[PDB]
């Protein structure tokens, strides 16, 4: 074939390391949501141009983790989501890497994720908690009720609610909500003291996991029975493309034709290609052209490239 991009394997030491670097830049570009994890590489193409023009056009299979993109935690300290709350999909990305000049760059990426079918998680786990809308009034109530508990423990700091990032519901023996939310530093000391260094505003300072259980069981005597059971835990923080979230996969369909995660990542529609001015490439003021080509199609797989799943549900 006349394809400048060679079809490479998915278990290669190089393709597995460059995919990790590509996933690092995708997570660093996101300012809302939770970080992704590389499960397996679906497809890999390497355009080995001279002077290290590696235009790696890879198709990746990812799984959402429990770390918010603002936490900026390492992939080692980020465990994947449980099966009842999983969010998975595909991430088509193009990555340039210049080995002799020590350069790594992600010119464009595009992601498509879908939450696991709530029907499938209740046939496999009837009493499991399933996610609810982030704009649910009850999730918002659980978020404020839990934040009030953390603020009641705080003896000089107050934290406001920014937004609900994750929301879930189940039945313990009555309503049970499991929310995650961003917290901002409340306006310094209300209207008291010199209040110096008040530049801590409109930016989230951390994320809190909370819960509410409203059941009619195990409680103290009539001497002071409690209404709801609240828990709160807080963890503080210390390019052209997007990740689009599609709805649930097949709850209406009792189950291949449609692309489960249709991703569109084309830099140029022309089959000849185009040049990308990478002038910020090392000390070099000139000689910065990067060769590009339209999105690699199907049927050109390496046969040894489905991808060995590093994280299987069973």
């Amino acid at each position: 074939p006349l394809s400048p991009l060679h079809p490479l394997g998915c278990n290669d030491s190089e393709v597995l390391a460059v995919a990790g670097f590509a996933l690092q830049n995708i997570n660093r570009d996101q300012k809302d949501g939770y970080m992704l994890s590389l499960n397996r590489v679906h497809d890999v193409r390497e355009h080995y141009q001279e002077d290290m023009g590696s235009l790696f056009y890879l198709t990746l299979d990812v799984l959402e983790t429990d770390c918010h993109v603002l936490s900026r935690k390492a992939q080692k300290d980020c465990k994947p989501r449980m099966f009842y709350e999983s969010v998975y999909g595909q991430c088509k990305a193009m990555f340039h890497i210049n080995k002799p000049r020590r350069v790594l760059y992600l010119p464009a990426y595009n992601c498509t994720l879908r939450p696991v079918s709530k029907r499938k998680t209740h046939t496999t786990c009837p009493d499991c908690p399933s996610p609810i809308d982030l704009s649910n009034p009850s999730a918002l109530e659980a978020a404020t009720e839990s934040l009030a508990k953390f603020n009641s423990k705080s003896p000089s700091k107050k934290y406001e609610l920014v937004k609900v990032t994750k929301a879930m519901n189940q039945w313990v023996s009555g309503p049970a909500y499991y929310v995650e939310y961003l917290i901002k530093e409340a306006p310094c000391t209300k209207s008291q003291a010199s209040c110096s260094l008040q530049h801590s505003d409109s930016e989230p300072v951390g994320i809190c996991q909370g819960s509410t259980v409203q059941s009619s069981l195990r409680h103290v005597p009539l001497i002071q029975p409690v209404e709801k059971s609240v828990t709160v835990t807080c963890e503080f923080f210390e390019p052209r493309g997007s990740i689009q979230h599609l709805p649930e996969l097949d709850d209406e369909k009792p189950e291949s034709p449609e692309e489960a995660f249709p991703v569109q990542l084309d830099l140029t529609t022309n089959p000849q290609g185009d040049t990308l001015d990478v002038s910020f490439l090392y000390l070099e003021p000139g000689d910065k052209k990067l060769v590009v080509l339209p999105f690699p199609g199907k049927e050109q797989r390496s046969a040894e490239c489905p991808g060995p799943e590093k994280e299987n549900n069973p």
Binding site: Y84, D133, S173, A176, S215, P221, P314
Partner: protein, 532 residues
Amino acid sequence: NSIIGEKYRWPHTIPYVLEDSLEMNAKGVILNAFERYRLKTCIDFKPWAGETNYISVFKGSGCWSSVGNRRVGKQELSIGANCDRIATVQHEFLHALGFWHEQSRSDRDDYVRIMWDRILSGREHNFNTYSDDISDSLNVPYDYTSVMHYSKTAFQNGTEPTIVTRISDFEDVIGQRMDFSDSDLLKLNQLYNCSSSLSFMDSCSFELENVCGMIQSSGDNADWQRVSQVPRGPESDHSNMGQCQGSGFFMHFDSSSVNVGATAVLESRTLYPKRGFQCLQFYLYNSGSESDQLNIYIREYSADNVDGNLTLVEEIKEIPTGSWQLYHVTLKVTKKFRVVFEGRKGSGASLGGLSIDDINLSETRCPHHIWHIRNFTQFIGSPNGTLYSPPFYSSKGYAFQIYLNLAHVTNAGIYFHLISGANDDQLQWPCPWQQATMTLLDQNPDIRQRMSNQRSITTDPFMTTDNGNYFWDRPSKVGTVALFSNGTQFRRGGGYGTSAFITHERLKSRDFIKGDDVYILLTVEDISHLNS
């Protein structure tokens, strides 16, 4: 109801791990749930020792489990916060064995109605229904009393029921979480080919002429007689009272017509223990004088002496007269044995005798204490239904008292109170990890058919009150002054249990209240050894 596939079956003896994340009360509760399985099913649980697939109980987000053996390896089961109820554990384990909810049957729509508009937005999948080609109902009819059926209020958005049972009488029946229903066991034991259980040994109600194979040897002077009534008392047996009178039989020892010292013996058939601990229970009626007594022996058969080693295990004296009384005897027999019941006429003018019925023998641990409440029906729903139990001593010298509150129009509540005792100057304060289990006995003749209501609380030595005091500290430090039945003042520490132990309708169901009497079986035990 049951999932279809040979692969979704667990081996009869399931390997488990009780993860460190679990609460102390939860760890304790789980093990008591394993005992209900051992008593009523052929399902057993053994601590994991390398088996490829195994259940792993841990404190997760609430209570959940996968349906059937998923052959994953470490399979998770979550018993988190507020999941420490025995029937909640029995329920999550029925999911693991291969059962969906009762209202998820293919036929469910003919029995219940799902009020879709009253359910919380997006909670539709909690009301799934499975086709007869993926779920097998095992030829058992629709069961409203199932321990796997949701309550009328599950996932409600308001005060209106989301599951309206088409027959009005069963709208509150659905949702029970007391024990397995008779249909719950019927399907489980069919699924797993259960022919025998680990703990069940014997149940005798004497409703048959062969009297459970009970022999009487060459009964000296007198014999026990299978009768359906005794003129002085009782008018009927214990197995059936307000239903049928002469249909129910029982053994009777007429002491009125024999001389002082006369004994009559009733020896059971040969029993084979497979555990080494047993609870022999039975209902005794005394119609003669307080001087008559019922001694209990155990005839154990060793290979050296084929005629047995008769050993007096318990002697029951001063039996209250004119009422059936529940008695529990603790055994510890390791070899094939017989239970020997000996009635004995004391030196007192008797006009009746000793009557025995509803004998049950299991390989279970006897309750530490029992609370017999008489004239029960009138306390339910009455503002003067504030019952206080007699004072008792824990196995560790901790004095306690139980509180039964029945003043609410709908629910009944039980509370555990510590109180000042004789050993207080020698005990560890605050009270460290003593699990108090309170059970409302369903007085059914067959122990395999009791859905007794059981609750447990574990004294947390770190729990504090609004004043900064330890909740389970010495009752003389943090306690309120209370009176004993004799008018002596004592100190009573804070109560702790549940406001919804049982609804008044459930309490009035089954046999919890038999002969207007109720029994609260109490077990307080140090579970501190469960964490590491």
